[PDB]
Amino acid sequence: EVQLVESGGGLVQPGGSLRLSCAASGFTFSSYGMSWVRQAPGKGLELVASINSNGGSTYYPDSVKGRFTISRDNAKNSLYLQMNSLRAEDTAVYYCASGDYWGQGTTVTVSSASTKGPSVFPLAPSSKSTSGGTAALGCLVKDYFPEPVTVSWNSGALTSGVHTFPAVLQSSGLYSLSSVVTVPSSSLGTQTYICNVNHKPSNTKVDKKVEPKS
Amino acid sequence: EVQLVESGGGLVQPGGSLRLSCAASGFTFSSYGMSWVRQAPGKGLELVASINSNGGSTYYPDSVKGRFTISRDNAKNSLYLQMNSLRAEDTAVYYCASGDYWGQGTTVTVSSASTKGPSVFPLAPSSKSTSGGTAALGCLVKDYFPEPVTVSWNSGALTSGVHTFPAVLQSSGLYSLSSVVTVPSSSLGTQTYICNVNHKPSNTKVDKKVEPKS
Amino acid sequence: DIVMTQSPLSLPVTPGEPASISCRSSQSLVYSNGDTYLHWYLQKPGQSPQLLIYKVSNRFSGVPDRFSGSGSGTDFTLKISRVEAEDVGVYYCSQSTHVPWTFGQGTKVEIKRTVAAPSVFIFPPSDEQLKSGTASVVCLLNNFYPREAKVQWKVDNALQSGNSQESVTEQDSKDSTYSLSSTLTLSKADYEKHKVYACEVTHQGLSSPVTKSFNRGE
Amino acid sequence: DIVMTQSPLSLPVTPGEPASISCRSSQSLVYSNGDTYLHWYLQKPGQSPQLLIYKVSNRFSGVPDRFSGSGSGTDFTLKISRVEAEDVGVYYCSQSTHVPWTFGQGTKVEIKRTVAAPSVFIFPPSDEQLKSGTASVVCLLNNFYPREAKVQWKVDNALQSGNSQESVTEQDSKDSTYSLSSTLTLSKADYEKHKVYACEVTHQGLSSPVTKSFNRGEC
Numbered sequence: 020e021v022q023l024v025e026s027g028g029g030l031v032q033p034g035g036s037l038r039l040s041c042a043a044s045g046f047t048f049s050s051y052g053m054s055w056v057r058q059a060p061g062k063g064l065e066l067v068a069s070i071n072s073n074g075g076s077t078y079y080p081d082s083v084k085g086r087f088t089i090s091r092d093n094a095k096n097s098l099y100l101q102m103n104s105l106r107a108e109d110t111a112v113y114y115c116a117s118g119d120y121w122g123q124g125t126t127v128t129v130s131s132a133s134t135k136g137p138s139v140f141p142l143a144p145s146s147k148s149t150s151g152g153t154a155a156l157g158c159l160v161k162d163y164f165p166e167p168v169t170v171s172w173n174s175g176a177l178t179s180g181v182h183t184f185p186a187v188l189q190s191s192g193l194y195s196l197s198s199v200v201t202v203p204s205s206s207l208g209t210q211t212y213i214c215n216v217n218h219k220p221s222n223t224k225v226d227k228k229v230e231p232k233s
Numbered sequence: 234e235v236q237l238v239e240s241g242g243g244l245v246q247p248g249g250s251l252r253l254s255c256a257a258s259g260f261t262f263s264s265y266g267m268s269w270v271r272q273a274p275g276k277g278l279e280l281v282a283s284i285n286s287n288g289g290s291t292y293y294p295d296s297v298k299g300r301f302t303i304s305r306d307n308a309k310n311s312l313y314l315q316m317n318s319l320r321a322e323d324t325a326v327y328y329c330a331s332g333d334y335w336g337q338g339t340t341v342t343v344s345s346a347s348t349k350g351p352s353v354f355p356l357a358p359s360s361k362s363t364s365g366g367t368a369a370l371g372c373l374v375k376d377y378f379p380e381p382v383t384v385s386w387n388s389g390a391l392t393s394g395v396h397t398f399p400a401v402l403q404s405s406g407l408y409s410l411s412s413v414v415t416v417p418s419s420s421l422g423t424q425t426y427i428c429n430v431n432h433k434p435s436n437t438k439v440d441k442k443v444e445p446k447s
Numbered sequence: 448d449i450v451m452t453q454s455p456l457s458l459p460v461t462p463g464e465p466a467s468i469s470c471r472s473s474q475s476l477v478y479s480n481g482d483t484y485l486h487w488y489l490q491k492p493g494q495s496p497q498l499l500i501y502k503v504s505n506r507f508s509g510v511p512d513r514f515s516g517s518g519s520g521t522d523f524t525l526k527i528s529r530v531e532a533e534d535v536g537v538y539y540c541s542q543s544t545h546v547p548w549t550f551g552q553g554t555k556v557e558i559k560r561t562v563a564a565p566s567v568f569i570f571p572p573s574d575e576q577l578k579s580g581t582a583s584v585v586c587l588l589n590n591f592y593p594r595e596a597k598v599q600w601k602v603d604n605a606l607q608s609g610n611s612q613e614s615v616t617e618q619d620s621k622d623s624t625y626s627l628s629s630t631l632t633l634s635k636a637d638y639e640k641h642k643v644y645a646c647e648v649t650h651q652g653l654s655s656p657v658t659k660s661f662n663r664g665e
Numbered sequence: 666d667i668v669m670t671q672s673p674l675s676l677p678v679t680p681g682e683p684a685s686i687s688c689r690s691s692q693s694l695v696y697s698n699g700d701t702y703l704h705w706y707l708q709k710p711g712q713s714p715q716l717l718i719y720k721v722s723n724r725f726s727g728v729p730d731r732f733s734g735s736g737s738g739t740d741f742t743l744k745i746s747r748v749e750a751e752d753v754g755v756y757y758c759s760q761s762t763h764v765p766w767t768f769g770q771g772t773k774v775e776i777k778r779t780v781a782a783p784s785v786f787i788f789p790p791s792d793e794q795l796k797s798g799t800a801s802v803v804c805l806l807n808n809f810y811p812r813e814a815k816v817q818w819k820v821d822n823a824l825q826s827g828n829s830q831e832s833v834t835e836q837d838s839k840d841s842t843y844s845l846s847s848t849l850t851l852s853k854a855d856y857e858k859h860k861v862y863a864c865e866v867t868h869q870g871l872s873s874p875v876t877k878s879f880n881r882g883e884c
Contacts, residue, residue: 184616
């Protein structure tokens with residue numbers, strides 16, 4: 020199995036720096052050129068930097084040339100990206116890539132604002148509030164910054180009928196989203212429902228139970 | 234979006250009884266014949282009982298005829314199975330099905346033994362305990378009864394590299410299994426690893442952090 | 448750099464029907480060894496890009512036959528013989544013949560499934576949030592198609608505007624539907640001085656607009 | 666009851682290659698209206714059965730063209746033109762022509778992928794479990810193929826027997842490999858009077874048997 024695992028993402032003040040790391044396994048890492056590709060939400064794939072097999076040839080777009088440095092350690096099967104003089108336009112998801120495979124990416128955001136943990140509120144269901152023939156319930160994950168947040172239902176045991184909406188920036192400059200789940204109306208009593216909310220940048224883990232309210 | 238959600242499973246003493254329920258949504262439930270099908274681990278699909286659309290027509294194999302009763306509530310969009318005089322050979326996963334779709338199933342165990350919660354032990358990773366180029370870690374989920382238990386990693390966020398093994402009955406009559414995950418060697422320090430263990434029949438929920446240790 | 452240009456950028460397809468994407472390169476992609484390093488990637492909703500076709504026409508591991516690539520020089524084509532629901536996502540053609548690695552703008556394939564009306568639910572704000580001084584009211588439009596829908600918030604039958612944000616999910620890879628949340632924000636004090644909160648949903652799958660609503664304190 | 670019979674029950678397939686399953690019914694399956702209620706179901710690892718083909722030859726919603734069904738009366742065939750990794754699982758033919766609904770014994774399709782050697786890891790018991798009185802030692806064989814593998818436990822070079830259980834996963838729907846846990850159970854006091862704990866793995870992808878081991882209380 021091939022794995023590419025980025026890490027090091029987070030929030031930085033403008034002008035500040037950040038180092039990203041990528042750990043690879045499942046293929047001959049030394050035999051492969053590697054690259055960092057980034058993507059702002061909605062946008063497409065922008066190449067940030069490339070380095071070749073032995074690690075002796077690099078390329079940079081003018082947009083980051085002089086600022087970013089792609090490094091490599093064929094022994095630890097790792098790939099690095101030193102980001103200096105960070106600009107607000109550098110805000111993006113950064114992927115580690117080999118051509119054949121892409122990591123899941125790490126989130127880099129550049130802003131002059133502090134990190135806030137989310138509040139998590141029940142979107143309580145109801146019988147009498149059924150939409151043929153499902154009930155709906157959820158969790159409101161509000162006023163956090165920066166991205167990302169992780170949301171699961173029942174420690175991952177509940178996945179069918181789940182929708183976790185894309186975060187939206189509020190005029191406050193804080194993110195907010197809802198995660199919802201629909202279940203057949205009659206199954207409402209039969210089980211308990213907990214949303215699992217994780218926001219690493221502020222070290223916030225919440226497990227909110229969601230009940231009918233009566 | 235069709236849903237079929239069974240509930241009511243669990244452990245019963247021989248001779249005792251149990252009621253299973255199935256909540257349906259996403260299709261015209263009244264318009265469909267329904268059945269209960271069971272499956273012992275390893276074995277194939279055994280029909281338990283059928284009911285037609287009305288439902289004023291039912292069938293039972295002789296193996297359960299006289300003991301089991303399949304009812305239907307076309308108003309609440311629900312299907313039922315009343316199981317009486319339960320026998321040890323009735324131990325199985327019971328599925329709710331319409332022919333087009335099957336629920337995830339609910340687990341029925343008929344035994345002269347008591348319910349016990351699991352212990353969860355770290356399967357701690359290390360170096361140079363690497364196997365090119367991955368490290369392995371996990372959780373040992375031991376001495377519980379009856380099935381099932383739910384295991385996830387990092388509240389559902391970590392899923393690739395994960396192997397959760399089929400439970401095995403020990404000679405003590407208690408189940409045991411391991412859940413393990415492999416990650417690229419040099420990504421060990423860069424993240425924390427919690428296994429999320431739930432065993433409903435005893436109300437046991439454990440989250441165990443797994444660390445390298447010295 | 449070698450510029451990659453895709454056509455179209457939006458590709459609506461009825462499932463089971465074929466689909467074609469064109470990719471043009473600003474320069475020949477034949478490398479000095481005679482090979483052509485034109486590739487196709489697919490980024491499914493919620494996922495990283497994955498490799499679909501490498502070197503014009505080679506299917507990557509796990510890739511079904513319905514995906515076939517062809518072309519030469521500067522003009523290439525990805526064909527999907529029968530678009531399945533799971534094929535939804537954005538397709539990128541890409542060249543690695545010369546540094547830098549470059550990508551097309553990306554084509555977003557959309558499944559043209561049957562019309563499906565949204566299930567609508569309205570959620571009052573929790574008493575817990577009301578401690579904080581703010582009140583979020585949420586309206587859920589679930590598993591509908593097509594994406595275009597209108598949500599109107601009416602407080603005490605007074606149509607709202609300027610105080611609500613929407614969020615849509617990407618097209619579902621299993622049933623080809625969307626879901627939408629609309630979140631009405633207002634002050635606690637503002638919230639308490641009204642009674643009827645309502646959400647009204649217009650969608651092509653509804654004969655007439657649907658309203659869900661609640662009265663504060665019932 | 667109309668009896669359903671499948672051939673074969675074990676079906677090894679090199680991926681990309683075609684596969685065929687036959688299904689015979691103990692009685693004709695055409696119904697009073699002239700239709701034939703013969704269906705194929707698929708149960709992927711860890712999942713419920715799902716409908717693949719209904720009424721001999723109709724692809725269910727979401728089912729790709731590589732799955733085609735054919736046949737008539739009492740003789741039916743499912744063909745998979747190009748078996749993909751994700752196609753792994755157990756296939757059942759089924760009739761609903763007459764009550765009761767019945768099922769074949771099931772055909773388990775195996776993906777014949779290339780040999781893959783297991784990555785092997787050994788885990789000592791936690792200090793925590795050792796307070797309970799029992800010591801579990803665990804050996805992991807990860808992402809290998811084929812499934813046949815031998816695990817032997819050695820304690821102070823004494824070969825063990827009768828104190829270890831194995832668990833194997835189902836074939837992976839993504840990389841077509843298996844994984845295996847072997848778990849050596851013994852008394853705390855038993856565990857303390859020995860020093861060298863070792864797991865020895867033999868597999869077709871290993872030129873020579875591989876041993877991982879640890880010594881009690883070292884790290």
